mmCIF file of all heavy atoms in Angstrom:
data_model
loop_
_atom_site.group_PDB
_atom_site.id
_atom_site.type_symbol
_atom_site.label_atom_id
_atom_site.label_comp_id
_atom_site.label_asym_id
_atom_site.label_seq_id
_atom_site.Cartn_x
_atom_site.Cartn_y
_atom_site.Cartn_z
ATOM 1 N N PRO T 38 34.768 67.581 50.690
ATOM 2 C CA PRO T 38 33.458 66.905 50.313
ATOM 3 C C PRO T 38 32.642 67.752 49.377
ATOM 4 O O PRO T 38 32.134 67.214 48.349
ATOM 5 C CB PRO T 38 32.804 66.684 51.643
ATOM 6 C CG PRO T 38 33.484 67.596 52.608
ATOM 7 C CD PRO T 38 34.900 67.745 52.114
ATOM 8 N N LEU T 39 32.483 69.053 49.668
ATOM 9 C CA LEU T 39 31.776 69.946 48.781
ATOM 10 C C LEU T 39 32.654 71.118 48.335
ATOM 11 O O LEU T 39 33.559 71.491 49.073
ATOM 12 C CB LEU T 39 30.516 70.495 49.511
ATOM 13 C CG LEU T 39 29.474 69.528 50.032
ATOM 14 C CD1 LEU T 39 28.291 70.274 50.615
ATOM 15 C CD2 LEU T 39 29.024 68.595 48.938
ATOM 16 N N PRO T 40 32.454 71.613 47.128
ATOM 17 C CA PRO T 40 33.285 72.723 46.688
ATOM 18 C C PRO T 40 33.171 73.953 47.564
ATOM 19 O O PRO T 40 32.056 74.376 47.928
ATOM 20 C CB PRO T 40 32.760 72.987 45.267
ATOM 21 C CG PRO T 40 32.123 71.717 44.839
ATOM 22 C CD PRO T 40 31.529 71.138 46.060
ATOM 23 N N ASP T 41 34.307 74.471 47.909
ATOM 24 C CA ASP T 41 34.432 75.624 48.847
ATOM 25 C C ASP T 41 34.547 76.959 48.133
ATOM 26 O O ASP T 41 35.475 77.703 48.332
ATOM 27 C CB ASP T 41 35.580 75.459 49.826
ATOM 28 C CG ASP T 41 36.848 75.033 49.139
ATOM 29 O OD1 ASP T 41 36.890 73.939 48.514
ATOM 30 O OD2 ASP T 41 37.827 75.839 49.164
ATOM 31 N N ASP T 42 33.567 77.246 47.255
ATOM 32 C CA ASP T 42 33.529 78.522 46.547
ATOM 33 C C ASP T 42 32.153 79.238 46.664
ATOM 34 O O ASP T 42 32.108 80.407 46.303
ATOM 35 C CB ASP T 42 33.872 78.372 45.058
ATOM 36 C CG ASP T 42 32.888 77.509 44.344
ATOM 37 O OD1 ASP T 42 31.789 78.006 43.997
ATOM 38 O OD2 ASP T 42 33.191 76.301 44.110
ATOM 39 N N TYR T 43 31.123 78.581 47.153
ATOM 40 C CA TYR T 43 29.827 79.148 47.285
ATOM 41 C C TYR T 43 29.354 79.022 48.767
ATOM 42 O O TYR T 43 29.401 77.943 49.325
ATOM 43 C CB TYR T 43 28.834 78.472 46.330
ATOM 44 C CG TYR T 43 28.557 77.026 46.584
ATOM 45 C CD1 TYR T 43 27.449 76.644 47.322
ATOM 46 C CD2 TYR T 43 29.410 76.013 46.129
ATOM 47 C CE1 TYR T 43 27.174 75.330 47.574
ATOM 48 C CE2 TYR T 43 29.141 74.712 46.383
ATOM 49 C CZ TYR T 43 28.064 74.333 47.123
ATOM 50 O OH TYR T 43 27.767 73.026 47.361
ATOM 51 N N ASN T 44 28.924 80.168 49.302
ATOM 52 C CA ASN T 44 28.080 80.220 50.509
ATOM 53 C C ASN T 44 28.849 79.870 51.780
ATOM 54 O O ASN T 44 28.408 80.175 52.877
ATOM 55 C CB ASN T 44 26.869 79.319 50.267
ATOM 56 C CG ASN T 44 26.170 78.926 51.564
ATOM 57 O OD1 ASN T 44 25.841 79.744 52.404
ATOM 58 N ND2 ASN T 44 25.919 77.605 51.710
ATOM 59 N N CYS T 45 30.009 79.247 51.676
ATOM 60 C CA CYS T 45 30.677 78.725 52.840
ATOM 61 C C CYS T 45 32.067 78.238 52.522
ATOM 62 O O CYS T 45 32.410 77.921 51.369
ATOM 63 C CB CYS T 45 29.894 77.536 53.452
ATOM 64 S SG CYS T 45 28.884 77.974 54.855
ATOM 65 N N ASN T 46 32.906 78.211 53.560
ATOM 66 C CA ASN T 46 34.166 77.492 53.561
ATOM 67 C C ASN T 46 34.083 76.479 54.704
ATOM 68 O O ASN T 46 34.353 76.809 55.854
ATOM 69 C CB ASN T 46 35.353 78.405 53.679
ATOM 70 C CG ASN T 46 35.794 78.992 52.393
ATOM 71 O OD1 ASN T 46 35.887 78.309 51.385
ATOM 72 N ND2 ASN T 46 36.097 80.303 52.358
ATOM 73 N N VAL T 47 33.680 75.218 54.349
ATOM 74 C CA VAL T 47 33.350 74.233 55.382
ATOM 75 C C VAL T 47 34.549 73.349 55.686
ATOM 76 O O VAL T 47 35.109 72.672 54.793
ATOM 77 C CB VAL T 47 32.109 73.401 54.934
ATOM 78 C CG1 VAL T 47 32.050 72.139 55.741
ATOM 79 C CG2 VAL T 47 30.867 74.187 55.041
ATOM 80 N N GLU T 48 34.971 73.331 56.976
ATOM 81 C CA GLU T 48 35.863 72.331 57.481
ATOM 82 C C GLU T 48 35.189 71.567 58.580
ATOM 83 O O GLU T 48 34.560 72.151 59.516
ATOM 84 C CB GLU T 48 37.184 72.952 57.973
ATOM 85 C CG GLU T 48 37.666 74.189 57.193
ATOM 86 C CD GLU T 48 37.046 75.436 57.671
ATOM 87 O OE1 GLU T 48 35.984 75.432 58.239
ATOM 88 O OE2 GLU T 48 37.655 76.552 57.428
ATOM 89 N N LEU T 49 35.332 70.261 58.561
ATOM 90 C CA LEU T 49 34.698 69.330 59.496
ATOM 91 C C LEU T 49 35.815 68.679 60.379
ATOM 92 O O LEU T 49 36.750 68.082 59.859
ATOM 93 C CB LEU T 49 33.955 68.241 58.808
ATOM 94 C CG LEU T 49 32.714 68.649 58.021
ATOM 95 C CD1 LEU T 49 32.416 67.602 56.946
ATOM 96 C CD2 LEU T 49 31.510 68.807 58.903
ATOM 97 N N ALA T 50 35.629 68.815 61.697
ATOM 98 C CA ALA T 50 36.613 68.255 62.593
ATOM 99 C C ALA T 50 35.915 67.364 63.629
ATOM 100 O O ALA T 50 34.695 67.555 63.894
ATOM 101 C CB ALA T 50 37.404 69.388 63.351
ATOM 102 N N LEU T 51 36.625 66.467 64.238
ATOM 103 C CA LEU T 51 36.178 65.659 65.322
ATOM 104 C C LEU T 51 37.078 65.830 66.514
ATOM 105 O O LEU T 51 38.286 65.868 66.383
ATOM 106 C CB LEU T 51 36.174 64.159 64.894
ATOM 107 C CG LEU T 51 35.168 63.230 65.633
ATOM 108 C CD1 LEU T 51 33.816 63.836 65.602
ATOM 109 C CD2 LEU T 51 35.174 61.877 64.943
ATOM 110 N N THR T 52 36.475 66.086 67.691
ATOM 111 C CA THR T 52 37.237 66.335 68.875
ATOM 112 C C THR T 52 38.007 65.041 69.293
ATOM 113 O O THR T 52 37.755 63.952 68.809
ATOM 114 C CB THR T 52 36.347 66.784 70.041
ATOM 115 O OG1 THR T 52 35.295 65.847 70.234
ATOM 116 C CG2 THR T 52 35.745 68.118 69.729
ATOM 117 N N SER T 53 39.000 65.239 70.158
ATOM 118 C CA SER T 53 39.821 64.123 70.583
ATOM 119 C C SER T 53 38.977 63.113 71.351
ATOM 120 O O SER T 53 39.153 61.884 71.159
ATOM 121 C CB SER T 53 40.956 64.642 71.496
ATOM 122 O OG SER T 53 40.467 65.089 72.756
ATOM 123 N N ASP T 54 38.044 63.547 72.185
ATOM 124 C CA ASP T 54 37.111 62.656 72.834
ATOM 125 C C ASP T 54 36.252 61.884 71.849
ATOM 126 O O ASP T 54 35.796 60.779 72.130
ATOM 127 C CB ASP T 54 36.261 63.380 73.848
ATOM 128 C CG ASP T 54 37.037 64.519 74.520
ATOM 129 O OD1 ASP T 54 38.262 64.302 74.792
ATOM 130 O OD2 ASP T 54 36.438 65.596 74.801
ATOM 131 N N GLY T 55 36.001 62.470 70.689
ATOM 132 C CA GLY T 55 35.249 61.828 69.615
ATOM 133 C C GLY T 55 33.755 61.869 69.804
ATOM 134 O O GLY T 55 33.063 61.116 69.085
#
Side-chain angles (χ1 to χ4, degrees):
Chain T
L39 302 184
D41 48 296
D42 63 79
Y43 65 97
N44 159 52
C45 259
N46 275 317
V47 162
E48 329 84 336
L49 294 156
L51 207 49
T52 54
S53 70
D54 322 325

